[PDB]
Ligand binder design. Sequence first.
Ligand code: TRP
Ligand code: TRP
Ligand code: TRP
Ligand code: TRP
Ligand code: PHE
Ligand code: PHE
Ligand code: PHE
Ligand code: PHE
Ligand code: PHE
Ligand code: PHE
Ligand code: CL
Ligand code: CL
Ligand code: CL
Ligand code: CL
Ligand code: MN
Ligand code: MN
Ligand code: MN
Ligand code: MN
Lengths: 454, 454, 452, 452
Amino acid sequence: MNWTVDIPILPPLPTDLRTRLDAALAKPAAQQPTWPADQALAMRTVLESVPPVTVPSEIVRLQEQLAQVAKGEAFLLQGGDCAETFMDNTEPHIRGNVRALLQMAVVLTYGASMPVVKVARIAGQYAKPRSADIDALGLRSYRGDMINGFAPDAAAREHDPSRLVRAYANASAAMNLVRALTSSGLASLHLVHDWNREFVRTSPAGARYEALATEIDRGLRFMSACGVADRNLQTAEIYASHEALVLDYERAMLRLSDGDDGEPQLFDLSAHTVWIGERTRQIDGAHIAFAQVIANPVGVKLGPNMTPELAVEYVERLDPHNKPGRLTLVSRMGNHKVRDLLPPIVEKVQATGHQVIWQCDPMHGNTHESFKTRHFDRIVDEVQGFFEVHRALGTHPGGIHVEITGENVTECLGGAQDISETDLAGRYETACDPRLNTQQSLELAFLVAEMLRD
Amino acid sequence: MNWTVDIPILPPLPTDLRTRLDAALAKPAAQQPTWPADQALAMRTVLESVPPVTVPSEIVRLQEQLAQVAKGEAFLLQGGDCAETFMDNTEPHIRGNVRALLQMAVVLTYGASMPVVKVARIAGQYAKPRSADIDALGLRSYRGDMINGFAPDAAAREHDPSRLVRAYANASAAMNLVRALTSSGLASLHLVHDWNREFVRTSPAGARYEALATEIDRGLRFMSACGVADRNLQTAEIYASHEALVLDYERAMLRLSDGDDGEPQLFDLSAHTVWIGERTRQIDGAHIAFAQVIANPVGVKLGPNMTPELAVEYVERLDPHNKPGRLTLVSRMGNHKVRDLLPPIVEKVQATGHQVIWQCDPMHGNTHESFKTRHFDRIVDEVQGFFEVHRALGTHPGGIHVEITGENVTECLGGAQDISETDLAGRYETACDPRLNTQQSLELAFLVAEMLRD
Amino acid sequence: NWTVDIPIDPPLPTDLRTRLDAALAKPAAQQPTWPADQALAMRTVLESVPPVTVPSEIVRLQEQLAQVAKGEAFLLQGGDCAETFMDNTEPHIRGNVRALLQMAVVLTYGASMPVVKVARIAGQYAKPRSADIDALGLRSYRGDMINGFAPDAAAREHDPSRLVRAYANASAAMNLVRALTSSGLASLHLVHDWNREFVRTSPAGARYEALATEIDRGLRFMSACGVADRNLQTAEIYASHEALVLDYERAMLRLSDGPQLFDLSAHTVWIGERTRQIDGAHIAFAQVIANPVGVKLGPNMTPELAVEYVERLDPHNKPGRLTLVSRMGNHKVRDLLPPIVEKVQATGHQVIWQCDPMHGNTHESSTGFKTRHFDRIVDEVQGFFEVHRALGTHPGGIHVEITGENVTECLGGAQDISETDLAGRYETACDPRLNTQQSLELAFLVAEMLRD
Amino acid sequence: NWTVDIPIDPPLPTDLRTRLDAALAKPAAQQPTWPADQALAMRTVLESVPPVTVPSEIVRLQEQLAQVAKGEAFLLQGGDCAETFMDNTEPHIRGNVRALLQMAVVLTYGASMPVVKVARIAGQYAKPRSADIDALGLRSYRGDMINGFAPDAAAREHDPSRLVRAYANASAAMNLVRALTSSGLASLHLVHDWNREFVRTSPAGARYEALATEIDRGLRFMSACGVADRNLQTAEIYASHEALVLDYERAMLRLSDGPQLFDLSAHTVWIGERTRQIDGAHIAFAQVIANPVGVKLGPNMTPELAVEYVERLDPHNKPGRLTLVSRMGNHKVRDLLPPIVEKVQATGHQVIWQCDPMHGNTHESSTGFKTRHFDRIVDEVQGFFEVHRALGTHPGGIHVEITGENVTECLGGAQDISETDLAGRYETACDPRLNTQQSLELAFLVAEMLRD
Ligand SMILES: N[C@@H](Cc1c[nH]c2ccccc12)C(=O)O
Ligand SMILES: N[C@@H](Cc1c[nH]c2ccccc12)C(=O)O
Ligand SMILES: N[C@@H](Cc1c[nH]c2ccccc12)C(=O)O
Ligand SMILES: N[C@@H](Cc1c[nH]c2ccccc12)C(=O)O
Ligand SMILES: N[C@@H](Cc1ccccc1)C(=O)O
Ligand SMILES: N[C@@H](Cc1ccccc1)C(=O)O
Ligand SMILES: N[C@@H](Cc1ccccc1)C(=O)O
Ligand SMILES: N[C@@H](Cc1ccccc1)C(=O)O
Ligand SMILES: N[C@@H](Cc1ccccc1)C(=O)O
Ligand SMILES: N[C@@H](Cc1ccccc1)C(=O)O
Ligand SMILES: [Cl-]
Ligand SMILES: [Cl-]
Ligand SMILES: [Cl-]
Ligand SMILES: [Cl-]
Ligand SMILES: [Mn+2]
Ligand SMILES: [Mn+2]
Ligand SMILES: [Mn+2]
Ligand SMILES: [Mn+2]
């Protein structure tokens, strides 16, 4: 019960790009799968000839849109599953996650009074880092479906390089549907807002969000009243992102491009934008060096051990040309620490004259065990603290990065539903970290819109 | 000190239109100037060859926009000076009245959540009816600058047919500027709203209107955030209207048109839309019969002696083809009477299956003497009662007709400025009835927007 | 053996499954011979995969095809005769999309009306046969959804896992088509610059200069007039293939959200000359799906059977739902097409009349290669236009086999491809395609038929 | 006497009035001889009337003229030689606007760039003279702003009330121009239908069929491509006249809201051949206003005086602020224009080079009428194009005298107007105009110069 692909038996990379890529990949790389080199090379050779998930002109367009974010003239929303799985890579699940992100985007667009750049964790979020090799059950840790299987048995946890090709197949299939959905009616502003209005009338805390929902509704109707050309309301752009973790995968998805802008560059065409996590951001490591040789916008996760001085080193290495929006610094401090730890980092980075996007990840600093879980109020409070830090400094609170789903899961405590510890057992479906369910993600949008409205 | 025009020494009217026009004009006509027939005919002959103030395709476009109003899908705002004068027919005064109307329109567009058709009392509002021939000073009454002079002496009050040509010259000059202003930046939504925001921060009652002003602001910014094509925000259409009173003038401004829609029709090209007042709406009179033979949208003022049965007769005579928006019925009952008198008229007219625009004139039923004056709260209360009548019947409160100016006059009592009886003497400038000043007109817009929001 | 294996892990409504099951009980010609249990397992995988297309796209195409049927638009359908998995690459997809778009610019200008642009792409992985045993004594190649092109027995086995490989390749191709057409490849100005360069370097460029310059001047006129230009920055390219392998097509059925059955493996599909049996499963399958459909009509067609297709496949008289695709041969089209058109017009229904000038015009070269002469291809389109001109009916579109590659598969054109030139770059896995230059030259020639 | 009399009832800033007063102390040629007290009273009326144009319109025109100066747009200027109060009617205005728009369609297509459309309208009420005493022994007609065309002594008196009559007629005309151009008369599709009908019925229609059909096909291509079409529904027609009567022009000065001085009697004005004295009041007046301005350059022009105009009137090097309007005669343009262009280009400034092919090509017929031959009109434009082609400079526009009336004033064209035909409909109050057919024929001929 296998499908079977052939290992395929152009002009070479420009000499300098080959040199730089090899140098980047020769550096130490944390959190890599352990599979045979010959097998990995077979899979890379397959992936080097597949159609790309994204194309360079979209990445250049995203860079332009992110430059507006960095300049204080747009807001970045990034969200989706903590981990995609091959099993749940289905039309309803994709449709649900795209809907949940669009619903947030409407509320955040209105609240920010500026465009929102909408970036899904989708079409490649198939690899995760682990602090431990051996898990709580004594098994080799699950590292996402690009590496091994979620099932709790030894054979499933074996690192399988064929998962590189399965991950690409699943990613391009998802991406095709995201494109179709967003261009063909799912992203109609009016339809998306109708879902928000239904949330407000059926949610336990709907009375809380009714006033802002109605103001949004009246804002939408005002556009029709004014006779606005409305094609821009019928569709939205949803960009693809994931953590750039498995370097066998990312290097195989590199393509060379440019006869539009000056010189040929390497673009990672597995996504539009990628980020480097806490456990793989070693300053002299392969992940950061790889990010230096690709043209895509990138982000780096910054946790509570971050110094102002290291943050500047990231900026100087990853934004060497001072291109607004090329670099996003993703704060994940914990709600109890963000107000204290973030200001000195922001000050020192702003003093460089570079314009990064400051993005809040309020998930990864606020996890505990009841089930691995997160309380909704701590999530909300970290974004609140993040906004306070920026208001005090006159800097731009540029966006959020959240883990969400359109599914009615029971993974995070709280929200208007008041999800309890005993409730968690009902629909705890994440392959990894607890996600805000569709209602909690929308509620967070409304709360953040009020922080924006200030 | 006279300029001097020549009395000019095509194919004739279609036989049926000539018959119908002659029959209409042979009927009794109230409130007509008393000047020699030979002199009137000389002036009409001059006016029969002048460039028209308006063109038929604009009137057909206005009919279409008014049909939406009648169907409950748009709102009609009509406003301007009670009487234009040749003396104040100046760029600042025109600009100020156009601004005051645009400012109202923004607030009303947002409040109604639907398009507003914007109709100025302008480029022809130069004639008024009088209940008395002899005024309080013993002089022949002033009847507007198309007939005689405002100055309180006998010679000025003589009816002068040369005022027909002066009125046209002044009207076309004003109309030219209204067109220029509205197409070239004065009607930019963003600029107009900036004036409203300034009103809110400097008005004595600005704190009252701050919340709705900010919601409007956020509605405007939302359009930019969504990337709306914005040329429709850079301009607005302001239509010209006046009371069709002086039949020598209106008949001379008739032009024949049509090779677009079936047959040639007579259009009154002195305005886009005209109305018939209380004192000239005799059912078998020349004014109503004249309105039957022109293609323009028309309105009829309905005062407190109106019966349901007469209202239906107006509808059947003036909207014989059941064309939504061809007829506007303009309620002016007084705030103390509107809730009682209007419902039976609305019911009986709705039962016909015709769709008229129901428009509230809250000025002409609410006048008293301290100076002729009106209290702002009675004006507001009549519109309130009008909205209540319609809410109860499920019918469409279709618009308002007000007398306003961009000037900081002191003519109506009250408003956030609390204009007192002693204040009236400061800037009582109207050639006729007391107007809401620029601040009072804007305040009324905000109050009516809340009636719309309900 | 230079392969890698990839492991494989609510139903449609009962009423619609009852319908489908009744339809698919009809005999199906040209089906793969793989085991039913294996086929079922693969269908079960495909029943839950993300679809290649979505229903609102198909509803939109139907609207645009209604306009073609009414004489207010023109249908351009084009791509590889047979897509292969190994050539399903970015350069090849980009080249085929480019080639179709280049034709569409010239045809839009020449027709003076919108062109509905439909690629043979993201699914054209199966073909009937041409014979039980091929010339090498092997089971015939049936396209990559069924078996492998490689001339060995093992490759030629019917492998139902190729259903999943086909879907993976289809969705990956469609993803790229969507990306390219939304991000700059379908910019009218860019596409027309490629056309200008063709006129500049083509051996017959002098012939097409005047019309190229007209188009250029029409394009500049748009800028001159200040039009809002976002609609010049992108184009819609729809996906199509021959609906042949019913295991694949049935597994890709989905219900719309409301609700109808759509085949979401493509936007539109057609039924070929060998599988259009009026009481067969392919026609029955086309009857039950909501997608716009086509039926190939070759020289054995009678007017009466044509009417039977209209009655089966357009029961509700929806203009443009059914396309009748003429493929007669240039020597027969003028004679055979008119009585079919007359009888079908007399039904009251509005079909699209589309010319396939390729499939009735194939012959074998003295040098061995299956080939087609460019002049016969052009002549059938010409005769097709003459038939419709004479009847007052709409010559609604063309259906061609083309590539952006500089292949040597069809004889003639301005390059004067000879029988000896055929050996250079004969790369098709099935029928000979117009190369990029020949396909654009055809577009210019058909543009002059539209202008005439 | 068949007339009716119409009774007549904060200052500009002191600094700007000081400037103006200094400028207007310069001698002014060709001014009316009415009494100063009367002139002052009329100016005082005009100082408070609603303006004919507004500053943001003039700023917008300046932006569009900057593009013409840079070779990225073309200037079309056209209308009556002299407007009269009695012909300032809806049919006549509509016809002249129609005629200009018809030319603009053909020229936009031919230039492959935007056309800035400027009417001689809403102000062209004054002219210099041609002589102290006309051929009837009367004081000369000076245009309707000054006196009456009627050949009697009383009509020929200089009457300053005509300043107010002029303003009333100007504002009424401009009102109508705005209405017509915003409400359907300037619909591209409608205007082009009039052009098609001209090609269909013109004696020389066969000559212009090919280009008319190209335009039609360019228009249909826009619809085919789905462009957002509101910008095809309207056009901007700007107002211009010769700034001659300084009492009128100074009284129509306004300050922008911020602030500059604009002459709000028009969008753009030019200074004629008889009043362009370098140290005169007209040049000084053009120097102080912010409007785009033109200067007529006839055959006595030297390159050096041309440079003096550039330095006086474009002190800030604002491209398109100054237009130099060549009127040499077709027999002299090729010889006289090049050295003027070279010297002016060497200044570094960017003027608009505009061809007036009318005023250097007037002669008298044997039958008495002042006339112009169409072939000489066309030939000067041709030579103008040749001069600029040879220098690598931009042939920036044309300035023509035209009407929508079927008059018989210019000899030739496809209608072959003869000397004997001139007596039929010679209606101009001054110079001979191209009739509606001749003006459109010229547009086709200049479109081919642009295409060549
Ligand atoms: N296209 C605009 C407006 C819009 C359409 N659909 C949306 C859904 C959510 C938010 C905004 C939108 C945008 O993406 O911003
Ligand atoms: N053109 C739109 C929007 C608009 C522009 N300017 C305005 C001023 C007031 C109100 C609305 C507008 C309209 O007239 O409705
Ligand atoms: N979107 C329009 C115009 C267009 C854009 N790109 C194109 C490429 C080819 C043909 C037309 C176009 C259309 O598809 O018709
Ligand atoms: N508004 C555009 C297109 C246009 C509309 N009507 C026209 C009439 C003539 C020429 C062009 C046009 C322009 O002025 O160029
Ligand atoms: N998600 C399923 C089906 C699938 C296969 C290939 C591409 C897309 C989806 C799998 O991994 O087998
Ligand atoms: N994928 C190649 C690099 C490459 C990118 C783009 C084109 C060619 C080569 C590697 O990993 O070494
Ligand atoms: N309002 C002034 C000036 C004026 C004259 C003519 C037209 C417009 C304005 C008047 O009546 O005399
Ligand atoms: N003005 C004419 C009627 C008319 C209208 C239009 C054209 C011709 C005549 C009248 O009063 O009698
Ligand atoms: N086209 C190649 C690689 C590929 C696999 C899956 C999807 C897309 C491409 C093959 O089928 O072997
Ligand atoms: N053109 C006519 C009538 C007219 C007067 C005023 C303004 C417009 C037109 C005249 O001057 O006598
Ligand atoms: Cl059955
Ligand atoms: Cl078979
Ligand atoms: Cl001085
Ligand atoms: Cl002199
Ligand atoms: Mn996570
Ligand atoms: Mn009044
Ligand atoms: Mn084929
Ligand atoms: Mn002249």
